[PDB]
Amino acid sequence: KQLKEKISNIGVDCLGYGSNDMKELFVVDPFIGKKQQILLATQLCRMILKIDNVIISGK
Amino acid sequence: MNFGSQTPTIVVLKEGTDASQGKGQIISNINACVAVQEALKPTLGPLGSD
């Protein structure tokens, strides 16, 4: 659907409504909040992948 | 004349003091530096690892 139509506010309806268009379902999120999910994730995983030596001193 | 039954010999260095002669120790010192060197071997370069 999203490849066909350019309207980009259709997602997964979890409450079981008959229509997936989110204009009528009253759901809104901030841009700064959804952006930080990608930024803090992709910036952390760079650090996770760059570890080769892993030394853990037993307590 | 003697004070007692026997008299054990004195160790020159203190008991537990490690010491060694020959070319074995300097090779061990070089191998010790190479052991520390191998930890930082793949770290060198832009594509290195933390």
Side-chain angles (χ1 to χ4, degrees), chain A residues 46-47 49-53, chain B residues 38-39 42 46 48-50:
Chain A
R46 196 209 310 287
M47 195 173 67
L49 290 165
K50 285 170 72 64
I51 301 301
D52 203 332
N53 299 21
Chain B
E38 288 287 1
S49 56
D50 298 334

Side-chain angles (χ1 to χ4, degrees), chain B residues 31-49:
Chain B
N31 294 329
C33 292
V34 170
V36 175
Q37 193 181 6
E38 288 287 1
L40 302 172
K41 273 281 181 67
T43 303
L44 182 60
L47 274 63
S49 56

Side-chain angles (χ1 to χ4, degrees), chain B residues 8-48:
Chain B
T9 190
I10 293 157
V11 187
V12 176
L13 279 294
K14 195 173 183 180
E15 190 175 3
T17 301
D18 187 11
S20 180
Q21 297 293 124
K23 295 146 282 296
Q25 192 67 26
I26 196 175
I27 292 161
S28 300
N29 296 14
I30 290 156
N31 294 329
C33 292
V34 170
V36 175
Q37 193 181 6
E38 288 287 1
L40 302 172
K41 273 281 181 67
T43 303
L44 182 60
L47 274 63

